[PDB]
């Protein structure tokens, strides 16, 4: 729609203005149960020919269920926690005796109901399949006859539709061992997911967003195995709640800004360390340093608030005016002169320095731009591919207006070489005090001698 960014040249960085955050803030839990029967021995005399698929399918079912029975750059400032917290609590509640019996009894005919547990938790119950009816009505009257013989093989294939899903279940919990990301469609189909979105206590615009983005919430959601006793095998889905929806959230890319000093290895330079997503949730902003935890889909981002920074609303002030007396504005400084480039949503920012061939070319008119020196940035609808150093990259080709603001080489504000290049956590205040104290030390050394 109206995607934009303004590449600052004062500090070479991209701020992708214009998005809607759709942040998750809570965990919605729900128990999904399958009912299933303790089949005894097949009770068949002879082998026949028609009854071969049934016998091996049921043996596969027995093996599957007995196997399930036998089952039971700002990252250093980022924390760690238990993502599976509510669902394991619900399962541990279900470990109490006589609790899952209430689910079994209450959900006898209704597809979805609500039960209240021993700790005031009353989220939801749901039944995914009805193997009681099909097994006790369409299979066992036939398979347990004298000298058994099925009526036809066509009665078996619909059984496949009731069994293969379960088989999916088994080898997707024997591989990932209880916790599965993303949730497969065999735990929860798309239509059944649409049913469940119409069930949890959220407002209807959240329901519309989840219905429009079923695969995204399917990607984000978890699954945890609960108890298996009384043959009512079940699991808790921990699909995300979504607190704030539709506030601006920008992606800050950074690019190096290093002087093209003739003497190699003596070019000190300072580059922004603020990569990631900044969404203005409530009166503050939430910062995600991990771009992999966040996901993007058609202007619509989706990211997790557990590994989030509740940074104050004054982040745009340092974003516009980098030399402001209100924010720390963390910067990494080093003498490295590395030709590196990044791709924003509506452009490519190259920072190739020294002897490095730098070309922006399209497939229509051959080459169209050559980057000599300094940090440079091209709009997405100006170029197609960029070659820097020995590597090629491709800019995004989605519609949006992008502008380049004329900034300044801030690296020339400071001394040509006083900057230390052996620190990995620094801000403008700390670096400024380091420069002040080094200047004080050198004038003291000059005054004493």
């Amino acid at each position: 729609q109206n995607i934009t960014e303004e590449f600052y040249q004062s500090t070479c960085s991209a701020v992708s203005k214009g998005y809607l955050s759709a942040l998750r803030t809570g965990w919605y839990t729900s128990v999904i149960t399958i009912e299933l029967s303790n089949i005894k021995e097949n009770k068949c005399n002879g082998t026949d020919a028609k009854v071969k698929l049934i016998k091996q399918e049921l043996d596969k079912y027995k093996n599957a269920v007995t196997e399930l029975q036998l089952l039971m750059f700002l990252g250093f400032l980022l924390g760690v926690g238990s993502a599976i917290a509510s669902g394991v609590a619900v399962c541990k509640v279900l470990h109490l005796e006589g609790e899952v019996n209430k689910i079994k009894s209450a959900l006898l005919s209704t597809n979805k109901a609500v039960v209240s547990l021993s700790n005031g938790v009353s989220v939801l119950t749901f039944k995914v399949l009805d193997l009681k009816n099909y097994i006790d009505k369409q299979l066992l009257p036939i398979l347990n006859k004298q000298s058994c013989s099925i009526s036809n093989i066509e009665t078996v294939i619909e059984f496949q539709q009731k069994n293969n899903r379960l088989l999916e279940i088994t080898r997707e919990f024997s591989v990932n061992a209880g916790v599965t990301t993303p949730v497969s469609t065999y735990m929860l189909t798309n239509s059944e997911l649409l049913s469940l979105i119409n069930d949890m206590p959220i407002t209807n615009d959240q329901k519309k967003l989840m219905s429009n983005n079923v695969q995204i919430v399917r990607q984000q959601s978890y699954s945890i195995m609960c108890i298996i006793k009384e043959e009512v095998l079940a699991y808790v889905v921990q699909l995300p709640l979504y607190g704030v929806i539709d506030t601006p959230c920008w992606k800050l890319h950074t690019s190096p800004l290093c002087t093209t000093n003739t003497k190699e290895g003596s070019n000190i330079c300072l580059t922004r360390t603020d990569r990631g997503w900044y969404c203005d949730n409530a009166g503050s902003v939430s910062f995600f340093p991990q771009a992999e935890t966040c996901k993007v889909q058609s202007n619509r981002v989706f990211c997790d608030t557990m590994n989030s920074l509740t940074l104050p609303s004054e982040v745009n002030l340092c974003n516009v005016d980098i030399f402001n007396p209100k924010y720390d504005c963390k910067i990494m400084t080093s003498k490295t002169d590395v030709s590196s480039s990044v791709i924003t949503s509506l452009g490519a920012i190259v920072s190739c320095y020294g002897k490095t061939k730098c070309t922006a070319s399209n497939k229509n008119r051959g080459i169209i731009k050559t980057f000599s020196n300094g940090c440079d940035y091209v709009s997405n609808k100006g170029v197609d591919t960029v070659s820097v150093g020995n590597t090629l990259y491709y800019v995004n080709k989605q519609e949006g207006k992008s502008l380049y603001v004329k900034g300044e080489p801030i690296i020339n504000f400071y001394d040509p070489l006083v900057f230390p290049s052996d620190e990995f956590d620094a801000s403008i205040s700390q670096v400024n005090e380091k420069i002040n104290q080094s200047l004080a030390f050198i004038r003291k050394s000059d005054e004493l001698l």
Partner: antibody
Amino acid sequence: VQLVESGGGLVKPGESLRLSCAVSGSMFSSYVMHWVRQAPGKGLDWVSSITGGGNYISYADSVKGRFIISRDNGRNSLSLQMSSLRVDDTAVYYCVRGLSGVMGVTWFDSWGQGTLVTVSS
Amino acid sequence: QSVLTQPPSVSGAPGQRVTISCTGSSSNIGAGFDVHWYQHLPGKAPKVIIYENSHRPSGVPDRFFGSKSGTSASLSISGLQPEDEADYYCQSYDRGLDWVFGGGTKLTVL
């Protein structure tokens, strides 16, 4: 944090007109907006909702498409269109600024000063 | 007309605790949705008294105490003070009429 808005008056029913909301929030982009109305006699009732950019419009069942809600983020303001006017429309109309819920819900926090809109005769 | 039903025929002298109860169907309140109570003193615009029945906003007394159970919510005022003449509300998110508001109860002193 306070709000100011205008647009009330005595207008014949049936025709469309403009309601404006001119909230002076210094960061009016994140908070969810609703408009409600209070008709004298009966109780107050929610009318319309909008969320940030304005891609999740919702209306009360009394007006399906009758009211057209919008906001402009850069001009920190909001607009509503009375496509149709029935005698029941007369009420004191309120902007209301809600915060983000712990689940998702609008808290309906600090409100506007209210504007009377009258449609009779 | 609201699914939120509460008796708007309540009054009490200052000094005692007054309990207000509003009930709803299965789809509102009882479908895991919270309740928000406001006030309507004449003149200055209505403001929230209590939200989701437990946490309270900045300038409020401790008199207001909110609670819910099943499909029914309540708000009590211990030791009524004189200027609490207002019209107090309830709120939920009925799956039909989206943001449904209660009729509102007129509380006055005697």
